[PDB]
Ligand binder design. Structure first.
Ligand SMILES: OC1(CNc2ncnc3[nH]ccc23)CCC(F)(F)CC1
Ligand SMILES: [Cl-]
Length: 167
C-alpha cells in the first residue's frame, strides 16, 4: 500500500492520473520522481523546467555540477540525483527528442531505467515538447516497465484519449 490517490489502474503495475506532476510530487513526496531530462540536464521547459522551478533552481545547480564532473548523459540513459523538496530522489531519464531527430527506438531503453526502482512517479517519456506520440509512449511504458509506475498526465484532453484508446 502506498499514498498515491485517484489513479486509474491500466495493468498489474501501471497507473495513470490527470495531474500536474509538480503538484503530485509536492503532495506524495514519493521516493522517486522521474524528470523528462535532456543529455545536458538543462531543465528549461516542459516537465523538467516545471520541476526545476519548483525546487527554486536547486535542481539546476546540482545538475550543472553533475555534468561538469561526468559529462552528458546518453539518449536512453539516466542518472539519480536529489529530489530536493519534491521527492527523496529524482531519476533524470533522457527519452529521444523527435524534434531533434533522435531514434524513437531509444524510448524502450529510456523506460528500462524505471526497472531499477520499485515505485516511481513519472511523466510519459518523450511526450510533450520531446515530440513523440504519447499513445505510443504509454504502450512502450506498459510493455517495458515491470516496477510500479504512477503516470501523471498534465493535459486533461490527452489523459482522456490515452485512457479511451488503451488496449
Ligand atoms: O504529460 C506530458 C508531459 N508534460 C508534463 N507532464 C506532467 N506534469 C507536467 N508538469 C509540467 C509539464 C508536465 C506527456 C504526456 C502528454 F503528452 F499526453 C501530455 C504532456
Ligand atoms: Cl511537455
Amino acid at each position: 500500500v502506498n499514498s498515491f490517490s485517484g489513479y486509474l489502474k491500466l495493468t498489474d503495475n501501471v497507473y495513470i492520473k490527470n495531474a500536474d506532476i509538480v503538484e503530485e510530487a509536492k503532495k506524495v513526496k514519493p521516493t522517486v520522481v522521474v524528470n523528462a531530462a535532456n543529455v545536458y540536464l538543462k531543465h528549461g521547459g516542459g516537465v523538467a523546467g516545471a520541476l526545476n522551478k519548483a525546487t527554486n533552481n536547486a535542481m539546476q545547480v546540482e545538475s550543472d555540477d553533475y555534468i561538469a564532473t561526468n559529462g552528458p548523459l546518453k539518449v536512453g540513459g539516466s542518472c539519480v540525483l536529489s529530489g530536493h523538496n519534491l521527492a527523496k530522489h529524482c531519476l533524470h531519464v533522457v527519452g529521444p527528442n523527435v524534434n531533434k531527430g533522435e531514434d524513437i527506438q531509444l524510448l524502450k531503453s529510456a523506460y528500462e531505467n524505471f526497472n531499477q526502482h520499485e515505485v516511481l512517479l513519472a511523466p510519459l517519456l518523450s511526450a510533450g515538447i520531446f515530440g513523440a506520440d504519447p499513445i505510443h509512449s504509454l504502450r512502450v511504458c506498459v510493455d517495458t516497465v515491470r516496477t510500479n509506475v504512477y503516470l501523471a498526465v498534465f493535459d486533461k484532453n490527452l489523459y482522456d484519449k490515452l485512457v479511451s484508446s488503451f488496449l
